[PDB]
Design a protein around this ligand. Sequence first.
Ligand SMILES: [Zn+2]
Ligand SMILES: [Zn+2]
Lengths: 370, 98, 549, 109, 463
Amino acid sequence: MAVTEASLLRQCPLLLPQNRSKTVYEGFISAQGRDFHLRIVLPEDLQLKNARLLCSWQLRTILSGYHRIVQQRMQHSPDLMSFMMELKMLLEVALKNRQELYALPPPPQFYSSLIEEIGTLGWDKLVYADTCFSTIKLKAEDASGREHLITLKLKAKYPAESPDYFVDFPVPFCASWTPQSSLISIYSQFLAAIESLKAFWDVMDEIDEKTWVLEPEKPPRSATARRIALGNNVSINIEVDPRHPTMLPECFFLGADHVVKPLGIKLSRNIHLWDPENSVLQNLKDVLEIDFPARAILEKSDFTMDCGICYAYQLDGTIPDQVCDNSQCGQPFHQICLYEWLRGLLTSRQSFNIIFGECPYCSKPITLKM
Amino acid sequence: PGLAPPHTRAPSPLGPTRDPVATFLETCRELPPSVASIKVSAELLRAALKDGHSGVPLCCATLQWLLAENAAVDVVRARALSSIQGVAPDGANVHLIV
Amino acid sequence: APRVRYLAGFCCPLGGLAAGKPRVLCHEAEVFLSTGSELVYVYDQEGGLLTAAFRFPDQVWHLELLAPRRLLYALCARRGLYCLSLDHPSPVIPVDPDACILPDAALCAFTLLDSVLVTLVQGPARWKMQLFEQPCPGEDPRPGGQIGEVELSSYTPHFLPVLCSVSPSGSSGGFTLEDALFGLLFGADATLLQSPVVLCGLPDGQLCCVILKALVTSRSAPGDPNALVKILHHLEEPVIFIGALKTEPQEDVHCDCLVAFGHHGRMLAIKASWDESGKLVPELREYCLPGPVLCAACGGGGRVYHSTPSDLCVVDLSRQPEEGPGGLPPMLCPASLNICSVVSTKLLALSAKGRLMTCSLDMTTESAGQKIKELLSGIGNISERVSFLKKAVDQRNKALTSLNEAMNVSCALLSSGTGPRPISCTTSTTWSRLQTQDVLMATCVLENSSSFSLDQGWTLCIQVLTSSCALDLDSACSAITYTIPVDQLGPGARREVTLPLGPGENGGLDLPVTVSCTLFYSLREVVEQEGVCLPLSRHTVDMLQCLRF
Amino acid sequence: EGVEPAPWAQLEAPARLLLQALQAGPEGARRGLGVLRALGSRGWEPFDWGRLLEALCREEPVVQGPDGRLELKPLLLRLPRICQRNLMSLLMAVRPSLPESGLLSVLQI
Amino acid sequence: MSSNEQERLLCYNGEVLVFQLSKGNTKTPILHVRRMVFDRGTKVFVQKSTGFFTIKEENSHLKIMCCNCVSDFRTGINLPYIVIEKNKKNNVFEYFLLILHSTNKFEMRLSFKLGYEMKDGLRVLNGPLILWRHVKAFFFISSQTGKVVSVSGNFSSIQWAGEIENLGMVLLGLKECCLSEEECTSDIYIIPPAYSSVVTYVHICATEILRISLIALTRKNQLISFQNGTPKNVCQLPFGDPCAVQLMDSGGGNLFFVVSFISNNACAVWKESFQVAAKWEKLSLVLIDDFIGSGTEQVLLLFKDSLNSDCLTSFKITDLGKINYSSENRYLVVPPLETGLKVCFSSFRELRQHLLLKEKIISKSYKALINLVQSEQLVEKIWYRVIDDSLVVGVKTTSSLKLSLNDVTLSLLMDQAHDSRFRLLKCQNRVIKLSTNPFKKECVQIITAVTSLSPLLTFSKFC
Ligand SMILES: [Zn+2]
Ligand SMILES: [Zn+2]
């Protein structure tokens, strides 16, 4: 309703006015099928510019990082009615965010069905299950003999709504979810995607084996990019279409302008002799009229010796100088980039010509002396 | 009650779900509508209703003659209704069509 | 791996044992047990056989022990205090009254320090603490001369009061506090004297300390209590268990916090702060645990092992200083009352049944599948009951909503908004005819104008008051009353009731007659004397309504 | 009086590092690509992006407009407007390798 | 069971004692105790110790009659007892009461030596006190006394026997009658004589000062509460011919009544809501205790010896919650479930507090209404009589309320819980002024209503 005599009943059923002069309300407030104790003292008139509001310590843990919010809302909100709307809305927010603490599953469907269904698959399949039982991650095999993993993140109702599927491989995966579908169903869909992309995988595996793939290190199955090295201090980066893998990619070369120019010319001249009945390597070798190095150096292949903020060597004369005092990062930077960076952080403090604060990559103490 | 002149909120009686002695006994010890109809000659009904009061020949005048003895016949005379839903003394509903 | 055991069980009454009286102590491997009967037992903790059973007269109320001397002091109810040599020159043994010392007879509590004995004795109105010697040479077991006496004037009288001594650092079956605290609670005097201080818990719930040094008197020299006994903090409820705790743990441990408990379950732990004014302040914390509390103890590291009637539950204080609330788990043992804590944790108790019990706290193919089966069966047993409680909750909610509306109707009615909006009840006079005679009837129309649906729990009462001026002769029928359930009225909706007022007797109607309506709410119906009655209208029928032309 | 924490404070280190980076003017976009190659390199090779695209919808309250208005904002309209444009530009470039479910929560906003 | 070769079971101290007669050839059959404990490791009962007792005279028909834990009167320690019949075929039966100790050692305490054979309600009680009947002749022998005693009163059945505060020993055989076992012969607040015709077995649970809270169960397979003879919270039991109820506590509050039946089957029903939580069948026996060492009750359920001629095969032990034991990875799932198990329990234990909090708030708000509206007793008291087909209610004033100044009335109001229908209720108001011994001086003003009764006796009853 308009007025907060019926509208306040309808929108706060469990707030029982104790006093005749409706100054103390007491009892429960509702949110996400959960009721909370709440005791809300007004002054002698209906003015929230001055009011008390006490809570259960339950509710106060759940209003943590909102205290100023609520105090401002008491001062800024015209009526009690709207105040309660704002307060519920804010509870709404608070719980859904802290979703890790709050999940009472209906066992009779859940924990039994999930067991039945993992039995339906086979027990070699499942590889990880979380003790909140929210996450699972499953395994599948190629005709090749490659493992590909699938994460599922599951809700209070598994069989009702979709399970959130998180997947590696580079085309967007489609799972037709019904209430009738189950783990075996989405698993068969996932196998279908595997056996479909078989060619693209063979291309990637063939490359990684018979060449010095250099930049993506331990490649995922999602990566379309392969910065291959060849000769010395020249490289080719090659971005591939999965749907037509053997077909021609967008490509270009890094290194010496005097070394690369001839290869570009030669490529532009032989590029009509690309053929999607050969392999990518068997096309590249005879198009560019070359053989590749199979790991000319496997230990000191390359460590990216660039700024790790701006990713340039030679920013206005300056060199990658300032490093991390850490064995696991070692990452060089620039004087300019690291100063601009650390000034900005809240963790940074500046002494006379010194700036203390966190390495961008590893969050360990790093010192900059201007 | 629905047809009534005032159209006033009278509560529905709903005659008692058991006898008091029946409820006593149950405590101490522990579907379609039925229909009837008739047909009759228009000539018979015309000849009998002639002295013919007014209005539409049949169905309405038939109902006026059936309930000429009920107090709420003048109301059905005004609205000229050939089908109505009364209640009863025992609270059950009955719909009578002509 | 059996985290419990049983040694023995006892002659329990119906329900179980009465709390406060039964006692348990562990010495080394021997265990000293009283079941709040006249009988005190001693069990070998290796083999759960009784070493020794001791028949006193009349209900042992308390024990204490001295390990050095190998002696046990024991308060018979209406007799005095009997000491037993554990050497002790059928496995039942009667005590001879020679073992009696201070037959004071009226003594309710008593405790022990080193070389000093404290009783506390009921009298008239005034309870008096005393203080005796206890002979430090291994002699004839004597009291000595009483050193002193006081009157706990503060107290004027099931629950025995309780005694705990507390010595400060530098200086024994009691407790030691830290110099900061000790100085904080008791003051310089006791600090400077290095004076033990003896805490009495009183059935009032007052928690009183007295400095012992400061209690030496004679016939010439009576103790003034107003001086000599003082009062820390008044729990409004009786006392069960006093101790103290090593919060911040970083045999004689110097504690930094002081513990009480109540029956209904206010705790009160206390601390030294030294905060916010560059000055020492005490840290009070009046928590509220569950239920009847039925005993308590202390284990290493700010962990208080207490019992309610349902469950044996623990509180942690260990880390402003200590803590906001004490939210407080079971350990899935029943009500044991009478608990003790030996420190290594291995606690011994007496269960409410009669049970003397030791709580010692801290892959396979297809057998794991049977474990899986087990766990499933468990949750399914449980789920059934979580469901039940959900529906109880729904009931409580639905009750609250109806009540909510009731308050709202009542509030609306009891305010004068200058038009009686929410509910109205008009009455109006009507002549009818019966048999022969013109009867005078009153229609009572009840109308709901407002939104509020008058659900179940509501009832209309009409009363038909005759003439006024109570007479010489009290009439036949002074008034009549009519009371009807209003059920599910709803908004806009309406009832009518007709009453006679009219000459049934004698052809005699006396006119100025009021018919007054009311509503009444019954709180019970939807689930000291308890309802509410709210006025509606009161219409006066006078001749000018009762004329017929 | 005027200390504010960065609205990605409470995030997983790598996404924190991505979003810290895209702050950085129009070279935000490339920095971002650079950022991802220099996280493929490190121990946690995978980017559970739908961790971040959940995070990008997740709401909190802000009080702007008149001096008295509570609103709910998602992340996307809360972090720096230059990070907004640089983000979407980076998403275009990485579109193929995103789960659709999470992605359409963004576009709704 | 009861024979020369047969056993009987019992549970003492979270363990299980098996008393078996064994024909040992020189001599008579010997009583052998096995005292067994649940391993928890091997998921069985394993023999932890034994006892034996040599019987003397070479006469047959040695026979166990019953067994339990009793509480010796001398010490106050529970000891298992056992009743042996020795029959010489002489129309003479001995009846030993033996008590077996902490030490697996025996002690005679009655010989007791009857002529006629003992049957129906043999019932052992605390101060080891046997109590029996033949032809409605109740007798008891204390181990104190040592002599046959007769029960003075005359009763049919002996439905409860046991010790109460202030009284010492008691019997409820007829629900009026409530003996002493010192000066044989309060019957005031025992269950109604209405229930006297249907009650076949009682199990008391509390006594306060005189007020008993008490269970029954009937021939109708019912199960009822009483608090000062106020029947709340009735059940219905699945099976027929119920024998007994024992009790389980099983946690914070999870209190059950486990019912055993003549049909070799059993229920547990959950106090808090008198409801079948579970049913089992064929139940050779039932026993109620911590076999585990959890510190809270389980129930042992034994299934029939048709399986093997071996006793504690075909068992099942439960809490009817977390504990259940009984007679290709999957393991990564286990900690998830155990986390769930504990979480379900967690939610249980919270909801209970939550609900109490609601009750508390409800009470707050009742009192709030009554203080919303707004000390001296204006009214003595209520009384009522039935005249023939007239109810008269009346109330006696105090001097404070002046009928000179105040028109008063009185109504009656029907409980809508009973009155499902809108009957108007009419009540006639009479004021009575009587002078008390006029030959200040006492006037008595009383106020009183009358109505018809027969309308209100529609439901057998009303308030
Ligand atoms: Zn740079
Ligand atoms: Zn670093």
